[PDB]
């Protein structure tokens, strides 16, 4: 988040989103123009979105129910086996990789 | 997907969708971890400018450089396939001896110095490629050019000499 | 019987060494660190011992403008 | 400097088990707090709403430095009660400047000065007080959520340890126990308040929290609800610590149980530091544009507490027969005025808040000195009241009853008028400083539409004035129940005093009685100064009131 | 005032110096320009006031 | 019995402890240098490895943008900014591979 | 499955296997005086569930705080290369303030039961 | 040559009555730029502490045992000396901060630095610390003498983050170098 110091010794994931919001505030707000900080409204929403993921969880949720209902309606002929997915990209398994790609 | 290390992963998701015809296609690097570490100093001896150009491109497009530096990335991949092929047309016994040693030694360079010295000499006399590590102390001999390794589980044979280019045997 | 430190500091140090060694030598050992910090680094540099440069713990991004390279372009694939 | 003084005093205390060193450890702590004032005065040559220090974790404001110096000066005055003996043999024969600086007086003084009293034998007492000052001073300067928690604990823990410092007292152990347990519950609300702020905003700096609150104030997925009701839980834990109703049940019980000299520091300092910290947090989080967030302001708790504290403080004090159970209820009604001034966030309300908090601290300090001095003055007085023989911890709390002060005008008339002026200043009677404080808060709240709370406040003041007048009725309307000790003034028993010169040579020897024993000057001069400030505030008002005008202008400027 | 001035503007210099992804930190060149101007404006303003006192010698 | 005299044991202890501190200076100095070599070897590999990873991310992002404009008809904007954000959540099928 | 989890499984089943064998294959003849408290042969007052005097409780109070202090030093020992001189200084100030509290414990003879 | 950039870090502007020289001046600079009054005031302030405890003893004897007052003077001596030095340090650094009259300090700073710039030496010296640890140190100690009464702190790091644009120093040195070259021609 806003600190800039993450779990691995590298920087926090939502630090770019926070630095952009502070940069926006200092570079738009002032006493001369109080309402310049309305420029920060989308920037402040992105910082919260990076933090809690409510908007992205709502997008995937709608997309995932839409995707699955199309899969059931979709015509099915032959499902790849688990072992066939494992074979994709190997040294001498050209037959399986082709089957995975329907080619 | 997130850079967080998973604690309860039980499933892998794969996408069989290919990159669109618009983006040029680059064949990916086929070397494994042991061959890539054995040739890493050679990567940077030839590909440093492109390796450094792709990183400065991404820093010039903060938050967006994945999409906006795809050509510099294609260039680094090509530069790196060039050295690999070069290390394969020449010096292939030496290259294999080094990275096959590295896999049995936790991929620790100090545990395979005799195979590194043999390969480094063969890469130097067929590619003009030298191993250079920046900011090593000048008071002491470089660690990769040292006869005795203190952390090596097996002592280095007295008859195995480090490879210093230029000076003869 | 026991010496007072401010009455005679050198006598107190002998008594503390002999009669309270664990506490007295704790202060000596602990004080030796700040004495090491103040004296060794100058002597180390006097004799030419050089503190090494830090090892890189992030990709070393070079400074200055990009180098405008020409090589390994798309047409070089095949 | 406060920490260097703590560490240096702790190193000397660590090598001594001598209890005769307590008076001198206290005198050195007064010198140490005077260096902190010199450093803080030197730091006052800048104009700014705040400068982040030490990695943004701390900050300095002109308001910050004024309040630290006030905390350091109040602390020097309270420290006087453990750095000077309560009674002094004074003789006209030993009264010149030459006599004081070049002549010595020898007499048996262990009993007359109470050399081996409990307030003169605790070695670590000025050391634990410095710890509370340090916690109070950091809390004013805190800039971060984690900084806030650590500083309020450093303040709170030392206040628990001061309440239990009289280990051989069952009353002090109980007040310490109640205060620690209920204050630990208070900190669990503060920690939950800070945690919910960090958990929802991702940041731990208040400076970042202020910007999120400011952007948010406009006129769909992340509404900043958490700020107001994380700050509400945060505020409830601090309303306990200042003893605002309905979180005030503890202070009447604890203040009455702990020793009086201890109650003076415990009941004054924490209020100064907490209300200053809350002041700047009330200003930044105010929404200048009314919206749905304004409907849920955490500052509404401050109005409930002021409304309740005004009502609870004045009413429950009506039937209090214990003098220290009465002072606590008096404070509870005064923090209602402070809370109401703090809740109206206006230039006039902020000047009123700054001035009310300083003047009540000096005035409530005067009350405690008079109480402590009236007790020490009963050494040459004797009583036969069945009620005054059943009181417990009479050494730690010499005066515990309002009735024990009955007829004190006939024992010490001018010390009684000093208390009368201080009490009348708590009522709000002109032309005393307490009237001007109360009417400034009434002004600001009248000008901002808080008419209903102004009506409540004036009605409660008449209710609160009833028990104030009962104290004054006991001191002046009835005869004393305390008579002069017949043995200490008998014209047949006297102690002999020798007056020596610069080198141990007798000048003259004098035979002295109990009428030659008086209150020590550090406590009479202090009461004399604060009484005179209260009385003649209408002539010395300009610099003091102008200080608060400038501090508030800076806070509201730019 | 409804505008917050950071008491600690040096928070813009925070962030870990290790394990940094390329293209991770946002460019703050406009931010540094701002603070440069505030400093140059304050010192400029101070330089005028002290010169006025010399003129009134 | 001088095997138990305090002075020669104090002497031999000071020698052993001074010798082992000498060997520790050399060891850590060598290891900090070995650490420098491991990090420069990693640094040369970072731009070819990250480039392959970025091609995979652009490819998976583009696919999901195409999948949404089919399934949901249009694309939903999670972030106001144009910056790529690595996904916290991904659409998954209702069943794993049958095995 | 991980070795660590399997290790916990085995040590638990060894604790059960030994316990089960005794609970099944040993004689069990509990009677009044067998089930009594040992007191060297003579019954006495049962006082082990009544408040008892611990003369070393001041050592437990100090142990809790010092346990917290050496825990606040473990991050330093695993972060010395980055901390360097600037971080060493703060860690020395931290140790120095803690040592003064220990000097208070030694000088006041808190740890000197007689 | 010209570093092409003279303000690299975002600093805090404080309203003060005099020019800001350094928001984080090195320890040695504070001692070197100290006026002789600063040693007069700091010595008087250090003597005040034990002298206060002496006067309290003469007028109102504590009645302590034989060795107590000597012990108490040793604490009062140190605490006075500790607060006296903190007072001596604050007087010099307020001038660096522009929070006290600093014409003399402003002129010695504009000479010492332009001497380092014409010599090619770094303005504020070389750190053995990393450039990020230098920043943490600048951030920790800038304006830290204003908290001396509570927590003290001193700058012992040769960092390059001092809150001032360095362009004035480079401008004067080149003009001074411009004047030097013309003067050397007539020889
Ligand atoms: C016990 C008392 C111990 C006192 C110090 C012992 C000796 C330290 C070494 C020495 O000779 O010091 C001078 C020596 C001079 O070196 P130089 O090469 O001549 O000058 C280099 C330049 O300064 C420019 O330096 P640079 O930029 O190239 O490098 C920056 C600097 C990096 O060094 C730093 O940045 C040091 C940080 C200083 C912080 C100042 C805090 C002051 C307030 C304290 C608060 C107390 C709260 C209670 O590197 C050094 O110079 C290395 C210094 C040695 C390692 C660091 C640790 C030493 C200080 C330990 C202090 C704590 C001791 C225990 C305290 C217990 C308290 C109860 O190093 C210093 O400058 C460090 C001074 C430390 C002073 C501490 C506070 C005093 C008041
Ligand atoms: C001096 C050494 C001394 O007196 O040793 C004898 C001293 C007691 O001897 P004594 O003859 O029984 O003393 C008679 C009276 O108590 C009279 O003893 P005293 O209280 O006159 O002297 C004790 C001594 C204890 O303080 C020191 O030793 C200074 C260090 O000095 C003081 O307490 C007064 C000066 C305080 C300076 C504080 C400096 C650090 C705080 C500021 C940091 C920034 O025994 C000790 O072990 C005291 C030294 C403690 C060293 C602490 C080491 C760890 C620090 C972390
Ligand atoms: C706002 C308004 C601000 C104030 C406006 C001005 C109003 C007038 C204030 C005048 C205050 C009194 C000043 C003189 C004084 O203390 O006379 C007391 C006293 C007069 O009564 P006495 O019965 O004749 O005294 C003999 C008894 O045996 C005495 O024996 P004892 O055992 O009873 O104790 C004697 C002595 C024992 O003490 C000592 O031995 C020394 C104590 C003084 C140390 C002075 C240090 C000077 C250097 C400072 C740094 C520069 O203690 C004192 O008498 C000191 C009492 C201090 C009370 C607190 C005053 C300051 C705080 C003000 C409170 C403000 C509250 C409201 C505002 C709240 C915040 C906004 O005279 C002396 O003690 C003689 C010495 C006088 C001072 C030294 C002069 C020579 C210096 C060397 C050459
Ligand atoms: C019975 C009523 C009596 C009323 C008395 C107080 C009236 C106001 C006094 C305001 C006061 C004292 C604060 C004490 C607070 C105590 C707690 C509250 C007490 C309430 C009773 C702070 O004055 C501050 O007031 C603030 C608000 O007005 C301003 O904002 C600050 O800029 C101002 O410094 C004093 O102002 C002045 O003090 C002098 C001292 O020597 C300062 O001199 C300088 O100090 C160094 C630079 O600091 C310099 O290097 C030094 O060379 C020089 O000497 C002045 O510079 C100025 O600071
Ligand atoms: C309200 C009272 C505030 C204190 C006050 O008057 O400070 C004035 C002054 C403030 O300090 P000062 O700034 O006048 O100190 C001298 C500064 N020169 C030499 C530059 C003029 O107080 C003192 O001088 C004494 C400081 C310690 C006081 C301790 C409590 C008595
Ligand atoms: C193994 C297969 C079963 C063999 C045991 C069958 C009968 C055991 C028996 O009577 O034991 C009596 C006695 C105890 O019988 P017990 O009936 O007093 O045991 C009481 C416990 N309950 C109530 C659960 C039954 O057994 C022994 O003490 C010896 C047991 C055999 C030991 C051989 C080595 C074990 C390793
Ligand atoms: C200089 C001498 C220092 C040590 C003094 C000593 O030996 O102990 C002194 C004393 C114990 O003896 P004491 O009780 O005084 O016996 C006579 C009775 N008056 O002890 C005391 O009175 C003080 C008790 C603590 C003294 C210090 C003991 C060691 C402190 C912890 C470890 C310190 C090392 C780490 C920190 C760095 C120190 C520089
Ligand atoms: C010496 O002349 O012969 C060996 C000697 C045997 O005894 P003796 O002959 O009587 O010695 C007379 C010494 N005046 O014995 C000796 O002199 C040997 C004495 C010891 C020599 C060094 C031992 C090894 C080094 C120290 C190990 C670490 C000691 C501390 C650690 C343990 C602490 C519990
Ligand atoms: C319990 C633990 C604490 C108690 C420790 C007691 C033991 C005493 C020894 C303390 C530590 C001493 C470390 C040994 C010093 C050392 O090794 O110095 C080496 C250094 C530079 O020498 P270097 O470059 O390593 O030599 C290479 C030769 N081929 O030399 C120098 O730079 C200076 C050497 C003189 C000082």
Q: Which positions in chain C touch H70 (Cβ < 8 Å)?
A: 6
How far is it, in rounded angstroms, from Cα H133 to Cα H131?
6
Cβ pair B2, F88 in contact under 8 A? yes
Q: Encoding tokens for residue H104?
A: 């003399």
- Quick check: B13 contacting A, CB < 8 Å? no
Minimal CA separation from H153 to chain D, in Å: 9
Q: What are phi and psi of D89, to 5 degrees?
A: -80, 115
Is the Cα torsion angle H87, H92, H97, H102 positive or negative in sign? Answer: positive
- CA angle (A49 as vertex; A2, F87 as ends), nearest 5: 105
Residue among D7, D11, D17 whose CB faces G108 most closely: D17
H-chain CB neighbours of D36 within 8 Å are 83, 149-150
Could you list the beta-strand ranges (E) of D206-320: none
Tell me how far CA of residue H124 lies from CA of C45, H159, H161, H162, in angstroms.
Answer: 21, 6, 9, 9
**Contact G100/D13, CB-based, under 8 Å?**
no
Give whole-number Cα distances, B110 to B38, B106, B160, D108, F35, in Å.
12, 10, 14, 85, 11
Q: What does the alpha-carbon distance between residue F48 and residue G62 come to, in Å, rounded to a whole number?
A: 56
Task: List pocket residues of ligand 2, CB cut-off 6 Å.
Answer: C 4-5, 27; D 4, 7-8, 11-12, 15-16; G 96, 99-100, 103; H 71, 74-75, 78
Question: Rounded to 5, what percent of chain B is helix, strand, coil?
Answer: 50, 0, 50
The number of residues making up chain A comes to: 103
Q: What sign does the dihedral B78-B79-B84-B87 (CA atoms) show?
A: positive
CA atoms D67, D73, D75, D78: torsion sign: negative
Token couple for D263: 């109650």
Q: What is the DSSP letter of D519?
A: E
Interchain contact, D56 vs E10, CB within 8 Å:
yes
| Among the listed residues E13, G86, E12, E20, the one whose alpha carbon sits nearest the alpha carbon of residue H127 | G86
Q: What are phi and psi of H10, to 5 degrees?
A: -80, 125
Domain ranges of chain B: 1-169
Mutate to test the pocket of ligand 1, among H156, H157, H158, H162 (most ligand atoms within 8 A of CB): H156
**Residue D497: in which H helix or E strand, if any?**
strand D495-500
Cα distances (angstroms) measured from residue B21 to each of C78, D70, F55, H107: 17, 74, 13, 67
Residues 6+ apart with CB under 8 A from A70: F71
Nearest CA in chain B to E20: B59
Query: Hey, are the CB atoms on C56 and F29 less than 8 Å from each other?
Result: no
- With H, G, I as helix, E, B as strand and everything else as coil, classify residue B105: coil
Q: How far is residue H162's CA from residue H7's CA, in Å, rounded to a whole number?
A: 9
**What count of other Cβ atoms lies within 10 Å of the Cβ of residue D241?**
23
DSSP-assigned beta bridge partners for residue D518? D88
β-pair partners for C11: none
Experimental method reported for this structure: cryo-EM
Contact partners, residue D154, CB within 8 Å, separation at least 6 = D131, D132, D134, D135, D138
In terms of phi and psi (left: phi > 0; alpha: psi -120 to 50; beta: otherwise), the region of D347 is: alpha
Listed resolution, Å: 2.8
- State how far Cα B73 lies from the chain centre: 16
Strands, E, within chain G: which ranges? none
Exposed/middle/buried for residue D521 (C-beta within 10 Å: 0-12, 13-18, 19+): middle
Helix (H) / strand (E) containing D512? strand D506-512
Q: Are the C-beta atoms of residues D437 and D359 closer than 8 Å to each other?
A: yes
What is the maximal distance between C-alpha atoms in chain A? 70
What 3-state class would DSSP assign to D500?
strand
Distances from the Cα of A18 to the Cαs of A23, D206, D375, E12, E13, in angstroms? 8, 14, 61, 10, 13
Q: How far is C36 from chain B (nearest CA, A)?
A: 23
Evaluate: CB of D74 within 6 angstroms of ligand 4. no
Distant-in-sequence, close-in-space partners of H48: CB < 8 Å, separation ≥ 6:
D31, H80, H84
Dihedrals φ, ψ of D346, to 5°? -140, 160
Sign for the pseudo-dihedral over CA of H25, H31, H33, H34? positive
Q: Which residues of B touch F63 (CB under 8 A)?
A: 15, 17
Distance CA D27, CA D194 (A): 39
* Range list of H helices, F1-99: 6-71
> What does the block give as tokens for E31?
């931010």
Which segments of H25-144 does DSSP mark as H helices, in order? 27-32, 36-59, 68-97, 103-118, 131-141
Find residue D142's DSSP bridge partners.
D58
CA-CA-CA-CA dihedral for D397, D402, D407, D411, to nearest 10? 20
Angle, CA D248 vertex, CA D247 and CA D253 arms, to 5°:
135
Q: Whose CA is nearest to atom 27 of ligand 2?
A: D11
| Closest to D536 measured CA to CA, from D431, D427, D440 | D431
Q: State the ligand closest to the CA atom of D525.
A: 3
Determine the Cα–Cα distance for residues D432 and B128; give it in Å rounded to an integer: 95
Q: What are phi and psi of D497, to 5 degrees?
A: -120, 135
DSSP tag of D161: H
Task: Enumerate the residues of chain B whose CB falls inside 8 A of the CB of residue E30.
Answer: none
Sign of CA dihedral H171, H174, H179, H182: negative
Nearest beta carbon to residue D24 from set H48, H68, H99: H68
Domain ranges of chain C: 1-78
Q: Between the CA of residue D214 and those of A37, D284, D289, G111, what are the distances in Å?
A: 8, 8, 10, 55
D215: Cα separation from own chain's centroid: 39
Residue closest by Cα to atom 33 of ligand 9: C44
For residue H15, report the phi and psi dihedrals to the nearest 5 degrees.
-75, 120
Per the listing, tokens 């007064």 go with: D30
| Residue in the block written with tokens 């009835």 | D478
Measured CA to CA, the distance from residue H160 to residue H11 in angstroms comes to 12
- CA proximity to D64, closest of D231, D279, D214: D279
CB-defined site of ligand 7, < 6 Å = C 2, 16, 20, 23-24, 26-27, 30-31; D 15; G 99, 102-103, 106-107
Task: Please indicate whether chains C and F are in contact, defined as at least 3 beta carbon pairs under 8 Å.
Answer: yes
Query: For residue H141, what are the contacts with CB-CB under 8 A and spacing of at least 6?
Result: H24, H153, H154, H155, H157
Backbone φ and ψ of B5, nearest 5° = -80, 125
- Residue F5 CA to residue F7 CA, distance in Å, equals 6
* Bridge partners, H110 (sequence order): none
User: CA nearest D423: which of D326, D355, D352, D340?
Assistant: D326
Q: Are D268 and D361 in contact (CB under 8 A)?
A: yes
CA H41, H46, H52, H54 dihedral sign is: negative
**Count of alpha carbons within 13 Å of G98, Cβ hemisphere only?**
17
From the list D322, D183, D332, the residue with the least C-alpha distance to D267 is: D332
Residue that has been written with the tokens 């901002």 in this structure: D448
Q: Which of D41, D69, D358, D545 to mutate to test the pocket of ligand 4 (most atoms within 8 A of CB)?
A: D41
In contact, D336 and D306? CB cutoff 8 Å? yes
Cβ atoms of D62 and D46 within 8 Å: the answer is yes
Report the C-alpha gap between D244 and H147 in whole angstroms: 31
Given a contact cutoff of 8 angstroms between Cβ atoms, the answer to whether B119 and B95 are in contact is yes
- In the block, residue with structure tokens 């010794």: A9
| Residues 6 or more apart in contact with residue A67 via CB below 8 angstroms | F67, F71, F91, F93
Place of tokens 């502070």: A22
Q: Are D44 and D151 in contact (CB under 8 A)?
A: no
Q: How many CA atoms lie within 13 A of D338 on its CB side?
A: 28
**Residue G80 CB neighbours (<10 A):** 11
Among residues E4, H79, H148, which one has the least CA distance to residue D54?
Answer: H148
By the 10 Å C-beta count (0-12 exposed, 13-18 middle, 19+ buried), E19 is classed as middle
Determine the Cα–Cα distance for residues D554 and D66; give it in Å rounded to an integer: 13
Residue of C nearest to B58 (CA): C61
Tokens of H46: 């250090």
Considering only CA atoms, which of D316, D150, D172, D170 is closest in space to residue D243? D316
Token pair 């550090």 is at which residue?
D522
Q: How many residues does chain F have?
A: 99
DSSP of chain C, one letter per residue? -PPPTTT-HHHHHHHHHHHSHHHHHHHHHHHHHHHHHHHHHHHHHHTT--PPPPPPSS--PPPSS------S-GGG--
Q: Are D82 and D120 in contact (CB under 8 A)?
A: yes
- Exposure of E44 by Cβ count < 10 A (0-12 exposed, 13-18 middle, 19+ buried)? exposed
Residue ranges with strand state E in D51-163:
51-53, 58-60, 87-89, 104-106
Q: b/e map of H106-124 (b: 16 or more CB within 10 Å)?
A: beebeeebbebbbeeeebb
Neighbour tally for G37: CB within 10 Å: 8
Q: How many Å separate Cα C35 from the centre of its chain?
A: 12
**Do residues H86 and H148 make contact, with C-beta atoms less than 8 angstroms apart?**
yes
Nearest-angstrom CA–CA distance, D199 and D204: 9
Contact by Cβ (8 Å): D73, H122: no
Structural tokens at position D361: 């601290």
Helix, strand, coil shares of chain E, percent, nearest 5, are 55, 0, 45
For chain D, give the longest Cα–Cα distance.
91
Tell me which H or E stretch contains D138.
helix D125-141
Alpha-carbon span H153 to H142, nearest angstrom: 10
Residues contacting D464, CB < 8 A, separation 6+ = D313, D314, D317, D330, D333, D427
Q: Measured between alpha carbons, how far is D518 from D92 in angstroms, rounded to an integer?
A: 13
Give helix D451-477 / helix D323-343 axis angle, nearest 10°: 160
Q: Which residue has the tokens 């060894």?
A: G14
Query: Residue H154 in contact with residue H141, Cβ under 8 Å?
Result: yes
**Residues on chain F touching A72 (C-beta within 8 angstroms):** 94
DSSP letter string, D342-371: HHS-SHHHHHHHHHHHHHHHHHHHHHHHHH
Using DSSP, state whether D511 is helix, strand or coil: strand
**Ligand 5 atom closest to residue D37's alpha carbon, by position in its atom list:** 27
Taking the C-alpha atoms of residue G55 and residue F93, their distance in angstroms, rounded to an integer, is: 67
Report phi then psi at D396, rounded to 5.
-70, -40
For D174-180, the CB contacts below 8 A with 24+ separation are D174/D257, D175/D253, D175/D254, D175/D255, D175/D256, D175/D257, D175/D258, D176/D254, D176/D258, D178/D250, D178/D253, D178/D254, D178/D257, D179/D250, D179/D254
CA atoms of D69 and D80, how far apart (whole Å): 17
Ligand 8, atom 19, lies closest to the CA of: F3
* Separation CA D160–CA D241 (nearest Å): 12
Q: Are C71 and B55 inside 8 Å of each other by CB?
A: no
How many Å apart are CA A92 and CA D438, to the nearest integer?
91
Kindly state the tokens that stand for D197. Answer: 């702020």
Residue F49 Cα distances to B20, B31, B39, D68, D558, angstroms: 21, 11, 14, 57, 51
Q: Residues D138, D143, D147, D149: is their CA dihedral positive or negative?
A: positive
The structural domains of chain G, ordered by start, are 3-108 (1.20.58.1610)
Compute the distance between CA of residue E23 and CA of residue H181 in angstroms, rounded to an integer: 46
**CA gap D76, D67 in Å, rounded:** 14
Is H53 exposed, middle or buried, given 0-12, 13-18 or 19+ CB atoms closer than 10 A? Answer: buried
Sheet with D104-106, strands from edge to edge, namely D104-106, D495-500, D506-512
Q: Which of B97, A58, G84 is nearest to C54 (CA)?
A: G84
What are the b/e assignments for F23-42, b being 16+ CB within 10 Å? eeeeeebbeebbebbebbbe
């Amino acid at each position: 988040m806003a600190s800039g110091y993450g779990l691995n010794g590298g920087p926090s994931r939502c630090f770019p989103f926070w630095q952009e919001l502070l940069a926006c505030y200092v570079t738009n707000s002032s006493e001369d123009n109080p309402d310049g900080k309305n420029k920060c409204i989308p920037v402040m929403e992105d910082y919260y979105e990076c933090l809690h993921h409510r908007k992205e969880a709502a997008r995937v949720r709608a997309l995932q129910a839409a995707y699955r209902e199309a899969e059931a309606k979709k015509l099915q002929e032959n499902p790849p086996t688990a072992g066939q997915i494992r074979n994709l990209g190997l040294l001498n398994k050209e037959e399986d990789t082709k089957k995975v790609h329907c080619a | 997907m997130a850079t967080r290390k998973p604690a309860f992963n039980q499933h892998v998701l794969l996408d069989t969708t290919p990159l669109p015809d618009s983006i040029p296609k680059v064949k990916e690097i086929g070397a494994s971890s042991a061959p890539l570490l054995s040739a890493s100093f050679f990567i940077g001896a030839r590909c440093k400018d492109y390796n450094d150009d792709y990183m400065q491109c991404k820093n010039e497009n903060p938050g967006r450089g994945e999409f906006e530096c795809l050509k510099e990335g294609r260039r680094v991949t090509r530069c790196a396939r060039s050295v690999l092929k070069d290390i394969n047309t020449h010096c292939l016994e030496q290259f294999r001896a080094h990275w096959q040693c590295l896999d049995n030694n936790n991929q620790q360079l100090w545990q395979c110095r005799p195979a590194e010295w043999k390969l480094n000499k063969c890469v130097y006399e067929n590619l003009k490629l030298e191993k250079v590590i920046p900011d090593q102390p000048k008071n002491s001999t470089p660690v990769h050019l040292r006869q005795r390794q203190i952390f090596a589980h097996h002592a280095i044979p007295p008859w195995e000499r480090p490879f210093i280019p230029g000076q003869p045997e | 019987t026991t010496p007072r430190f401010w009455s005679t500091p050198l006598k107190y140090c002998r008594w503390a060494a002999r009669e309270r060694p664990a506490l007295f030598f704790s202060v000596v050992i602990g004080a030796l660190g700040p004495v090491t910090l103040a004296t060794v680094p100058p002597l180390r540099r006097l004799i030419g011992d050089v503190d090494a440069a830090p090892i890189p713990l992030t990709y070393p991004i070079p400074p200055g403008p990009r180098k405008q390279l020409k090589g390994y372009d798309d047409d070089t694939e095949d | 400097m406060i920490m260097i003084s703590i560490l240096s005093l702790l190193l000397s205390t660590s090598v001594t088990l001598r209890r005769d060193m307590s008076i001198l450890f206290n005198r050195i702590s007064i010198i140490a707090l005077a260096y902190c004032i010199l450093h803080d005065t030197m730091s006052l040559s800048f104009i700014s709403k705040g400068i982040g220090l030490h990695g943004g974790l701390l900050h300095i404001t002109n308001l910050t430095q004024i309040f630290h110096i006030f905390i350091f000066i109040i602390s020097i005055l309270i420290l006087q009660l453990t750095s000077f003996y309560p009674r002094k043999v004074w003789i006209p024969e030993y009264s010149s400047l030459k006599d004081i600086f070049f002549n010595k007086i020898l007499y048996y003084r262990t009993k007359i000065i109470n050399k081996m009293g409990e307030h003169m034998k605790i070695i670590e007492y000025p050391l634990i007080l410095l710890f509370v000052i340090s916690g109070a001073v950091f809390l004013i300067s805190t800039n971060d959520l984690v900084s806030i928690f650590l500083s309020i604990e450093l303040q709170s823990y030392g206040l628990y340890l001061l309440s239990t410092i009289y280990r051989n007292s069952e009353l002090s152990t109980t007040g310490g126990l109640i205060y620690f347990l209920l204050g630990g519950l208070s900190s669990c609300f503060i920690l939950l308040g800070t945690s919910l702020l960090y958990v929802n905003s991702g940041t731990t700096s208040l400076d970042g929290l202020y910007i999120l609150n400011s952007i948010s104030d406009v006129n769909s997925w992340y509404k900043p609800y958490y700020l107001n009701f994380s700050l509400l839980i945060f505020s409830i834990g601090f309303l306990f610590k200042v003893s605002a109703a309905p979180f005030h049940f503890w202070s009447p019980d604890v203040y009455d149980a702990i020793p009086t000299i201890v109650t003076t520091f415990v009941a004054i300092i924490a209020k100064i530091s907490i209300f200053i910290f809350l002041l700047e947090l009330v200003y930044y989080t105010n929404s200048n544009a009314n919206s749905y967030l304004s409907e849920f302001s955490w500052t509404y708790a401050l109005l409930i507490s002021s409304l309740l504290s005004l009502i609870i403080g004045t009413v429950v004090g009506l039937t209090q027969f214990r003098i220290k159970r009465l002072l606590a209820y008096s404070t509870i009604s005064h923090v209602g005025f402070i809370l109401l001034a703090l809740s109206v966030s206006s230039i006039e309300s902020t000047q009123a808040f700054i001035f009310y908090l300083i003047q009540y601290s000096i005035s409530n300090l005067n009350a405690f000195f008079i109480l402590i001095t009236i007790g020490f003055s009963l050494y040459g007085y004797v009583t036969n009241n069945k009620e005054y023989k059943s009181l417990l911890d009479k050494n730690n709390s010499p005066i515990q009853l309002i009735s024990q002060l009955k007829g004190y005008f006939y024992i010490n008339p001018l010390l009684s008028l000093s208390l009368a002026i201080t009490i009348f200043s708590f009522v709000g009677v002109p032309p005393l400083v307490g009237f001007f404080a109360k009417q400034m808060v009434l002004s600001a709240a009248l000008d901002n539409g808080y008419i209903f709370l102004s009506l409540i406040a004036i009605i409660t003041s008449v209710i609160g004035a009833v028990y104030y007048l009962n104290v004054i009725k006991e001191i002046f309307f009835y005869s004393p129940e305390h008579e002069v000790n017949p043995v200490l003034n008998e014209s047949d028993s006297n102690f002999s005093l020798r007056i020596l010169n610069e080198k141990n040579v007798l000048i003259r020897s004098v035979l002295l009685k109990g009428r030659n024993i008086f209150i020590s000057s550090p406590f009479s001069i202090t009461i004399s100064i604060i009484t005179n400030v209260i009385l003649l505030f209408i002539f010395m008002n300009k610099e003091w009131l102008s200080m608060g005008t400038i501090l508030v202008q800076i806070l509201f400027s730019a | 005032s409804r505008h917050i001035e950071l008491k600690y503007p040096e928070v813009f210099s925070h962030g870990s110096p290790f394990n940094v992804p390329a293209g991770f930190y946002p460019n703050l060149d406009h931010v540094i320009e701002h603070y440069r101007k505030q400093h140059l404006e304050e010192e400029e303003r101070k330089a005028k006031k002290l010169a006025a006192a010399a003129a009134a010698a | 019995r001088g095997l138990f005299r305090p002075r020669p044991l104090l002497a031999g202890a000071a020698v052993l402890m001074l010798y082992g501190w000498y060997k520790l200076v050399k060891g850590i100095r060598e290891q900090n240098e070995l650490a420098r070599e491991k990090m420069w070897a990693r640094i040369h590999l970072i731009p070819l490895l990250q480039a392959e990873e970025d091609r995979d991310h652009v490819r998976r992002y583009l696919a999901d943008q195409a999948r949404e404009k089919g399934l949901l008809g249009e694309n939903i904007k999670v972030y106001n900014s144009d910056r790529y954000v690595r996904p916290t959540f991904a659409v998954t099928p209702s069943k794993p591979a049958q095995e | 499955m991980s070795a660590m989890s399997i290790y916990i499984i085995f040590v638990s089943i060894i604790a059960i296997l030994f316990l089960a064998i005794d609970l099944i294959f040993a004689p069990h003849n509990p009677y009044k005086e067998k089930l009594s408290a040992f007191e060297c042969g003579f019954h006495s007052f049962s006082q082990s569930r009544s408040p008892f005097n611990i003369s070393f409780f001041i050592y437990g109070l100090v142990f809790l705080l010092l346990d917290l202090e050496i825990l606040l030093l473990y991050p330093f020992a695993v972060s010395e290369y980055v901390n360097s001189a600037y971080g060493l200084a703060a860690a020395l100030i931290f140790i120095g303030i803690i040592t003064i509290g220990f000097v208070y414990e030694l000088g006041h003879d808190a740890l000197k039961v007689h | 040559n010209t570093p092409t950039q003279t303000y690299q870090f975002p600093s805090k502007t404080v309203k003060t009555d005099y020019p800001l020289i350094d928001n984080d001046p090195h320890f040695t600079r504070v001692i070197r730029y100290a006026r002789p009054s600063d040693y007069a005031h700091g010595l008087a302030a250090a003597a005040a502490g034990p002298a206060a405890l002496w006067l309290m003893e003469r007028i109102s004897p504590s009645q302590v045992g034989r060795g107590g007052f000597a012990k108490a003077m040793r604490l009062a001596g140190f605490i006075g000396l500790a607060g006296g030095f903190l007072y001596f340090y604050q007087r010099s650094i307020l001038r660096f901060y522009g929070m006290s009259e600093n014409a003399r300090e402003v002129e010695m700073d504009m000479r010492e630095m332009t001497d380092r710039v014409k010599a090619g030496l770094p303005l504020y010296g070389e750190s053995r610390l990393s450039p990020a640890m230098q920043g943490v140190a600048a951030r920790q100690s800038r304006y830290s003498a204003l908290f001396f009464g509570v927590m003290p702190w001193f700058n012992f790091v040769n960092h390059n983050q001092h809150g001032v644009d360095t362009a004035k120093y480079y401008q004067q040195a080149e003009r001074e170098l411009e004047a030097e070259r013309l003067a050397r021609e007539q020889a």
